[PDB]
Paper text:
In this study we present a structural and functional description of the bacillaene synthase β-branching enzymes PksH and PksI. These biocatalysts are responsible for the final two steps in β-methyl branch incorporation in this PKS/NRPS pathway. There is a single active site per PksI monomer, with each active site positioned on the periphery of the trimer, ~ 43 Å from one other. Akin to PksH, PksI adopts a characteristic CS fold, with a ββα core, that comprises two approximately perpendicular -sheets surrounded by -helices.
Assays were conducted using WT PksI, along with the point mutants PksI-H230A, PksI-H235A, PksI-K80A, PksI-K232A. Of the four PksI mutants investigated only PksI-H230A was found to be catalytically compromised, with barely detectable activity for 3-methyl glutaconyl-SNAC and significantly impaired activity for 3-methyl glutaconyl-CoA. Surprisingly, PksI-K80A and PksI-K232A both display catalytic activities akin to that of WT-PksI, with no evidence of functional impairment. In tandem with kinetic assays, the crystal structures of PksI-K80A, PksI-K232A and H230A were determined. The active sites of each of these enzymes displays the ground state “closed” conformation as observed in the WT enzyme, with no evidence of significant structural perturbations within the active site. These data thus imply that the observed kinetic effects are not attributable to global or local structural reorganization within the enzyme as a consequence of the amino acid substitutions made. Crystal structures of the mutants PksI_K80A, PksI K232A and PksI H230A revealed no significant changes in active site architecture beyond side chain identity. We thus propose a His230 dependent mechanism wherein this residue has a dual function both catalyzing decarboxylation and to act as a proton donor to the decarboxylated intermediate 7 to give the reaction product.
Numbering used by the authors:
A (entry chain A): -4 to 70, 85 to 224
B (entry chain B): 4 to 249
C (entry chain C): -2 to 70, 84 to 131, 135 to 225
The structure:
């Protein structure tokens, strides 16, 4: 059960169990902003997972208090989880800001942390959310909360979202990863081909509609 | 006028329903002034957010008793005028600050706002079926769209009355506040929206509601078809007479 | 008040306009035997022939709602969906596999805090379940329920945020009756016209994707 980093060493791959792989985002310099290094290393991580079809669950996470921070001051990640053939769990133990929040919403299962901040903050900068965001937030959070989240671009603690009602488990940051592993262990009780077929079914419409409805 | 138009800061326009006489039911005046208020806002590219609200303990009460009788008689339809879509057609975000009771068509009108805020103490109901006729005003579309299909079946089939607090216990995605705070909250949200450029607000709303603007006419048509089957019976006239405001 | 042919479903008239359909195959704990299937089909055909009824309350007995597909090898689920009037699934007992899914085909779904619910189908839930679960529970929560095929107490679902009334088992049937009385105050025509409108797409889409 190995542990390696990717080419620029800002993602670490950690085999938790024979059929569970954890993708750990750890660009400490950029607090996991979408730098070119995090971008390349994440693609590599999911390319590695595609190349080794023994896994039954992916757990995507960040480090300390940062899940992902979205596009940098200078500056396709979203579809990585959606196109991965097996269930991906976004364990958002840390802040999820902008495209970093949205990216988590494309995983099959999403876990929030109570103390962390989440924001689709695009509009705070004057611009509209990617078309990827505008498509996925309503689908994962419902239409009405998506309106509010996208139009106003405000900042939400995990606890406030929890209070407003979201379908995601919301937990103390210190528990998010443990819960994600337990959940990955339960997923791994299934044959890998049943998980893939079922995922194929559940996300067909997204994979079919996302491509076009992207321009 | 029974509708008052208040600017807040530079770019917020408050639309206050205040037909005290009919408790903000759809009197002919309220209807006309609402259409006109929204026409005037659409013509003003200063505005970036609308706050739709009522007065005192009332947000909006839906059809007047005379109103519903005239329809029941075959004289008029809910599609005459077209209130249901005011907030959906408005290019800028609309906040329904439901500081008071939302009843029947008045509740449904408000649900077409991009952001809906309820009062904990007030009552909300899609009470169309209490009178024995089927939901109008886009209720069969916007209620499942905002509150989810499951909860909407219960709301629409049974026509029950819920306090804001009940809806908050069932898990609705709207912010629920004591009544005294609903309008303050709407204002801060509106200022926060007004910080964005207008073109971005309009463009993002266009993208979020295209599918609603596309689909809503076909649902209005289905609903008119259900009205033709259910409105024009004697037991419906008895219900509008005996159960109104009950 | 009388039983169906195999005796494993009791029809109980609560009032003139409210009919209770009680599944009570005690031997199989409301598993999907031939007898339960035939008796439920019989129950819903009786209801169709007796349009004084304006609401149906579908129920199990004791701590069981229904336990799903028979040790043996469906068309069942469309029973509540194709019923002209509103059906309330008062799931006062466990809902396992198909027994959870059948309840989700009712117009109103009431869970019991203390009861266990799962869509637990080496088999993919197929159906059916992958059809109706996201539509009733919402997409995101469905992904979890389906991918993991986990078991949940009613109280767990209530904390995670379902649109269903979730009650102590002891109050479930009482709440169902109160709601059924409120539904029965509407004219029948109104109820059936609205239901036809609300569940038309489901009636449409189910047959196609019951070959797939």
């Amino acid at each position: 059960l190995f542990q390696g980093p990717m080419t620029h060493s800002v993602v670490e791959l950690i085999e938790i169990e024979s059929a569970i792989i954890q993708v750990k985002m750890q660009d400490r310099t950029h607090k996991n902003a979408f730098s070119q290094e995090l971008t390349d290393d994440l693609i590599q991580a999911f390319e590695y997972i595609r190349q080794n079809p023994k896994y039954k669950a992916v757990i995507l996470t960040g480090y300390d208090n940062y899940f992902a921070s979205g596009g940098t001051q200078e500056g396709n990640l979203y579809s990585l989880a959606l196109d991965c053939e097996i269930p991906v769990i976004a364990a958002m133990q840390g802040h999820g800001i902008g495209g970093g929040f949205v990216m988590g919403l494309f995983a099959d299962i999403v876990i929030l942390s109570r103390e962390s901040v989440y924001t689709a903050n695009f509009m705070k900068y004057g611009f509209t959310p990617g078309m990827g965001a505008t498509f996925i937030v309503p689908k994962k959070l419902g239409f009405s909360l998506a309106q509010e989240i996208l139009l106003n671009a405000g900042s939400y603690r995990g606890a406030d979202l929890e209070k407003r009602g979201v379908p995601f488990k919301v937990l103390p940051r210190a528990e998010v990863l443990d819960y994600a592993v337990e959940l990955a262990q339960e997923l791994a009780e299934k044959p890998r081909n049943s998980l893939v077929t079922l995922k194929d079914h559940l996300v067909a419409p997204l994979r079919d509609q996302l491509p076009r409805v992207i321009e």
